[PDB]
Amino acid sequence: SALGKLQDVVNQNAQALNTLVKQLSSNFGAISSVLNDILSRLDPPEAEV
Amino acid sequence: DSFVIRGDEVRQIAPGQTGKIADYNYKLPDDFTGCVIAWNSNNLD
Structure with a gap:
């Protein structure tokens, strides 16, 4: 850990991208997170919400 | 638009x-x- 600051930069960027990708799985208050599924099993007027 | 339908169809005719x-x-x-x-x-029928 001699190169602490540079390794910290790399880790911070990896952390940001990783959490950004993790947010996709989050439900966000809808019936399901995966978008194809929410499209498939509801009518378009209801699925829109 | 004019048409004649039954009471349940009256509910049926709504957007979506x-x-x-x-x-x-x-x-x-x-x-x-x-x-x-x-x-x-x-009465009309």
């Missing part, structure tokens, strides 16, 4: 609703429909 009349007979668009006015016509 799904029913035997709604699926095939008559479909409202996924957009505002101005108004829907329904009254029984049994």
